[PDB]
Symmetry: C2
Subunit: 371 residues, 2 copies
């Protein structure tokens, strides 16, 4: 039995083709092809339903201490209403999940993590809360019930602007604020996304979720976008998909996510998994996540990657055709000496080797709104 978000009937009413995703029923696409939906997102904007993601709040005076004991980012340095992408890492340096953490001006941390890792992540945070409370510290956690919508694309901001009093130009990439959206009070708008385009994510009380979705969709610039387009868009943007490109068996260094380590904590070697991660940062690491491009048929997950001498050196973790570049793009792991952009490699596609080239990611330049 698949779980349903507050927009379930909304999706079906608009031609959504529902499929199973992390135990939820979500549209893989609607009436337009996922390829056209993908292109529409980069020229205008698309609305995605991400209400299945886990939304939590960390309360208490020791909220930052709790969070930093679990993630690799510089959380203390976050200014009010400023957030950062980060990772949950275990003592061995493996990635438990990727997330976004925001320091709200309400005195709490607002966290959003993967739908497919909600049981694991919630238990992890609960365990830490329990640990700290037993030590007499002040901390707590709340699971939010709000729906979550993502409006992404070059015209996403202007579409939302018609529904908010706040001048969105004051909401730079990775900052957020609580505002009334299209009549719905208590929404949190964050300048973020999973597409590489400018965009916002809206945490909206369920009672007003459908109203908000409809209000946004009424704008000619907007079209709904499903799972397929969401995947091709994030891949072109060089963004990881937990469970595919990174997992508990990959550290932030192997995953080419060294940038997620907080500036202060990286230099101090003070973060979860540092004993394994630091030596890798210095160079002692066996593999690296790289981007790959090729012609012909698309490279797919689990496909072997070989050098020109017939030796298997790695595996593709994600891959699909790129509508924006009209080439096939993919992510995979290869030894460091084969990770330089421009390197030619062989990838098994449909039981036959195809010539591919290592490419620097993102494949499609991002268009974030920064000051």
């Amino acid at each position: 039995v698949l779980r349903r978000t507050p927009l379930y009937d909304f999706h079906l009413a608009h031609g959504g083709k529902m499929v199973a995703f992390a135990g939820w029923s979500l549209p893989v696409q609607y009436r337009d092809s996922h390829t056209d939906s993908h292109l529409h997102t980069r020229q205008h904007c698309s609305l995605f339903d991400v209400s299945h993601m886990l939304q939590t709040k960390i309360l208490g005076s020791d909220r930052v201490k709790l969070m930093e004991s679990l993630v690799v980012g510089d959380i203390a340095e976050l200014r009010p209403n400023q957030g950062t992408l980060s990772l949950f890492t275990n003592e061995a340096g493996g990635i438990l999940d990727d997330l976004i953490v925001t320091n709200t001006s309400e005195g709490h941390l607002y966290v959003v993590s993967n739908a497919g890792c909600w049981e694991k992540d919630l238990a992890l945070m609960q365990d830490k809360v329990r640990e700290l409370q037993n030590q007499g510290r002040d901390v707590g956690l709340e699971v939010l019930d709000n729906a979550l919508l993502a409006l992404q694309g070059p015209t996403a901001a202007q579409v939302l602007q018609a529904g908010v009093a706040d001048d969105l130009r004051k909401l730079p990439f990775m900052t957020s604020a609580v505002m009334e959206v299209f009549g719905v009070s208590g929404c949190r708008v964050t300048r973020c996304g999973y597409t590489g385009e400018d965009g916002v994510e809206i945490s909206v009380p369920v009672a007003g979720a459908v109203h908000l979705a409809t209000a946004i969709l009424k704008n000619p610039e907007v079209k709904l976008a499903g799972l397929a387009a969401r995947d091709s868009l994030r891949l072109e943007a060089g963004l990881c998909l937990y469970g595919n490109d990174i997992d508990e068996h990959t550290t932030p260094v192997e995953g080419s996510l060294s940038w997620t380590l907080g500036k202060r904590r990286r230099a101090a070697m003070d973060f979860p998994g540092a004993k394994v991660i630091v030596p890798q940062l210095k160079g002692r690491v066996q593999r690296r996540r790289v981007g790959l491009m090729c012609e012909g048929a698309p490279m797919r997950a689990h496909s072997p990657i070989l050098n020109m001498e017939g030796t298997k050196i790695g595996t593709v973790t994600s891959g699909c055709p790129s509508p924006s570049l009209k080439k096939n793009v993919a992510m995979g792991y290869v030894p460091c000496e084969y990770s330089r952009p421009g390197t030619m490699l062989l990838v098994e596609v449909r039981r036959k080797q195809q010539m591919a080239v290592v490419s620097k990611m993102p494949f499609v330049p991002t268009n974030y709104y920064t000051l």
Copy 2:
């Protein structure tokens, strides 16, 4: 990595033999044999750590409507601070989990459900919360972070009475109240248990959990008890163990839990699976959960139950030696014609047919405290 309750160290210092249980680290027993611990519980009182159980609060003016859309009991009829055992059912009439729900004098329902089904149960309630909010109703859900202790036995009330101002003789079976216990304020004490004896359950803030357990244990009447004893006690008491005696393929009627079906609920047919369940109340049921007793080798779960001619008619769901009766006890399903107490049957024990007798449950008379 096993999750730890706040009493992790407490258990280790008291001789607790830790084992994995639903992803948590809990003592299967301590220094005393589980059979002696069992006998101790029915003569004095034992302390059990059940902090791994899911504790949730349902908020809002429509909290009762929400819970009733998920359970089979008459929740509205519960007096302030009165609770009842109930069941989450699916549209097929099967049971998703058993639970205890209390209608607190505050503005919320206090729910306690199985650790082994927390992911399932939490998702069920959270999704229903969102569905009702979408419909314009007022409801919410909070996951409590408190520990949970159960003090069970004929001298349990006497022991706890030394740590509370409230007159426990005025706290009847299945009623509860917020109290300061042994110096720890904000605890919720409920007159309930999983042993058949008189007893209480104490929801206590993590910060004061160890203090409370330590204080309770100072009284010589008390001895810690683990999982093995917990299981033999509940079985003798005729109490179900979700996943064993009842599951998604057993209705409340087949599971001999017709009493959990609310009078009003039966007439309204407004609970999941009512179309299937209610009709069975007439007698249209193919099987029924019963208690079994025998000598020699213990009856074990999954063992076939046969009539005296040797024809298979059912299956054992739970079984273990009974310290209180000095015989073997078990639960299982058989057609209604063989459910009358005293019925002679055969059970495949250690690959051999062994004679058993259907026994009325509870096997051991309960000692619940009622006015």
